[PDB]
C-alpha cells in the first residue's frame, strides 16, 4: 500500500486574537507539523470557502477562448510581453488538461512605484470584461485581502513556533508591496483523458504534476474534495487527504533557506485523477527587497552561515527553475 500522511488539523483562530498562551499552543502545533511531514490543515480560519469555490467555478466554466487569448500570459500570447505571471494559463485540448488564472497584489497599478520603475516580478493585473463576468474582479480582489489576512495570522504562528516575536515574518508581508499571488486552477474531467497530460513517476504512479518544493515563504491552499496530493518521506510518498473546509498549509523553499532546513519545504506531487476539481493556492511571498537573516534553531547560539537572500531575487530564480523542471503550467 501507499500509506497515509499525518496531516493534523490546527485551529488557528487564536492567531487573530490577544490570548498569548493560546497563540503559543497553536505555534507548537505548527512546529510539530513543520518538523514531521510538513503539512497541516488550518481550520477555523474565518474565510468563506464555499463563496470562493463557487465564484471560481462560475468563472472557469463561462470564460470563452476569445477571452482566454485576451488575458493570456506571454507563454500563450506573444502580444502580451509584460504578462509573465498575471493572466490566463490555457489548456491545450488533447495535450494539456490543467488551466488557470493568476493575479497579483491589486495595489500594483500604473502609478505604483514598482510598476513605474518596471521592477521584475511586478505586473498590473488583467481582468475579464465586467459585463461577461459580473462581480468576478471584486470577488477576486476581496479574496486576495481575505487570504492575505489569514496568511498574516499564520505567519505570526510560524514566527512564534521558531521562538521569534510574532512579527518576525509578518513585518515583511505588507499590502503595499507583497509579491503574493493567487492562482485559480481548474483540473477537468475528460473522457478520454489526454495521455500527454499524464506523467509516470519512477515509482509507477500516474501524475498531473511532478515532484517539487514550493517557491514561497509558505503556501496557503484551498482545494475541492478530490484526493490528489502526495508528500515525500524517507519511506516513499504518502497520500494527503482532502478537506474542502480547511486550508492546507506548507512551507516553501524560502522558509527552508531562512531556517537552515529546520523547517523543510516538503517535496510533494500531484497524482493524476480523472475528476473535475479546483486548486486555489495563495503563495505567500514578501516584498521585492525583503531580506530575512537566516538562523539555525538547532544551535544554542542560533547562528547560521547562510547568506541572507533577497526575496525578489529568490522569487525570480524560483519561478524560472520551476518552469524548467516541471514544464509550462
Ligand atoms: C499548489 C498546487 C498546484 N501547483 C502549482 O501551481 C505549481 C506547484 S505549487 N506551482 C507553480 O506553477 C508556481 C506558480 C506561481 C505563480 N504563477 C506566480 O507567478 O506567483 C497544483 O495543484 O498543481
Ligand atoms: Fe506545490
Curated annotation (Swiss-Prot):
Keyword Metal-binding: yes
Cofactor: how bound: Binds 1 Fe(2+) ion per subunit.
Keywords linked to the UniProt accession: Antibiotic biosynthesis, Cytoplasm, Iron, Metal-binding, Oxidoreductase, Vitamin C
GO annotation (BP), single: penicillin biosynthetic process
All residue ranges annotated as the Fe2OG dioxygenase domain in the record: 174-286
Binding positions (isopenicillin N): 85, 89, 181, 187, 279
Catalysed reaction equations from the record: N-[(5S)-5-amino-5-carboxypentanoyl]-L-cysteinyl-D-valine + O2 = isopenicillin N + 2 H2O
Binding site for 2-oxoglutarate: 277
Residues binding Fe(2+): 212, 214, 268
A Pfam family: DIOX_N
Assigned EC number: 1.21.3.1
Localization annotation: Cytoplasm, Cytosol
Swiss-Prot/TrEMBL cofactor(s): Fe(2+)
Site (Transition state stabilizer): 209
Predominant location category: cytoplasm
UniProt record similarity statement: Belongs to the iron/ascorbate-dependent oxidoreductase family.
Function, as annotated: Isopenicillin N synthase; part of the gene cluster that mediates the biosynthesis of penicillin, the world's most important antibiotic. IpnA catalyzes the cyclization of the tripeptide N-[(5S)-5-amino-5-carboxypentanoyl]-L-cysteinyl-D-valine (LLD-ACV or ACV) to form isopenicillin N (IPN) that contains the beta-lactam nucleus. The penicillin biosynthesis occurs via 3 enzymatic steps, the first corresponding to the production of the tripeptide N-[(5S)-5-amino-5-carboxypentanoyl]-L-cysteinyl-D-valine (LLD-ACV or ACV) by the NRPS acvA.
The protein's name in its UniProt record: Isopenicillin N synthase
Organism of this sequence: Emericella nidulans (strain FGSC A4 / ATCC 38163 / CBS 112.46 / NRRL 194 / M139) (Aspergillus nidulans)
Lineage: Eukaryota, Fungi, Dikarya, Ascomycota, Pezizomycotina
Record gene name: ipnA
Amino acid at each position: 500500500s501507499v500509506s497515509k500522511a499525518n496531516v493534523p488539523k490546527i485551529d488557528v483562530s487564536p492567531l487573530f486574537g490577544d490570548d498569548q498562551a493560546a497563540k503559543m499552543r497553536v505555534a507548537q502545533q505548527i512546529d510539530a507539523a513543520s518538523r514531521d511531514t510538513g503539512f497541516f490543515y488550518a481550520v477555523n480560519h474565518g474565510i468563506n470557502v464555499q463563496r470562493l469555490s463557487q465564484k471560481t467555478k462560475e468563472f472557469h466554466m463561462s470564460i470563452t477562448p476569445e477571452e482566454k487569448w485576451d488575458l493570456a500570459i506571454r507563454a500563450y500570447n506573444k502580444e502580451h510581453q509584460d504578462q509573465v505571471r498575471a493572466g490566463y494559463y490555457l489548456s491545450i485540448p488533447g495535450k494539456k488538461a490543467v488551466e488557470s488564472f493568476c493575479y497579483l497584489n491589486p495595489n500594483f497599478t500604473p502609478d505604483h512605484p514598482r510598476i513605474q520603475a518596471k521592477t521584475p516580478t511586478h505586473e498590473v493585473n488583467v481582468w475579464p470584461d465586467e459585463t461577461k463576468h459580473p462581480g468576478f474582479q471584486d470577488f477576486a480582489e476581496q479574496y486576495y485581502w481575505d487570504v492575505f489576512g489569514l496568511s498574516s495570522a499564520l505567519l505570526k504562528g510560524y514566527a512564534l513556533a521558531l521562538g521569534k516575536e510574532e512579527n518576525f515574518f509578518a513585518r515583511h508581508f505588507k499590502p503595499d508591496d507583497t509579491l503574493a499571488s493567487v492562482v485559480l486552477i481548474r483540473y477537468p474531467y475528460l473522457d478520454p483523458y489526454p495521455e500527454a497530460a499524464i506523467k509516470t513517476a519512477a515509482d509507477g504512479t500516474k501524475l498531473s504534476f511532478e515532484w517539487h518544493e514550493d517557491v514561497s515563504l509558505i503556501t496557503v491552499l484551498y482545494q475541492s474534495n478530490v484526493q490528489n496530493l502526495q508528500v515525500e518521506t524517507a519511506a516513499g510518498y504518502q497520500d494527503i487527504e482532502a478537506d474542502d473546509t480547511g486550508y492546507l498549509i506548507n512551507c516553501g523553499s524560502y522558509m527552508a533557506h531562512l531556517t537552515n532546513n529546520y523547517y523543510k519545504a516538503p517535496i510533494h506531487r500531484v497524482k493524476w485523477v480523472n475528476a473535475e476539481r479546483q486548486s486555489l493556492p495563495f503563495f505567500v511571498n514578501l516584498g521585492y527587497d525583503s531580506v530575512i537573516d537566516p538562523f539555525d534553531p538547532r544551535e544554542p547560539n542560533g547562528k547560521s552561515d547562510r547568506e541572507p537572500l533577497s526575496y525578489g531575487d529568490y522569487l525570480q530564480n524560483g519561478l524560472v527553475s520551476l518552469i524548467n523542471k516541471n514544464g509550462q503550467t
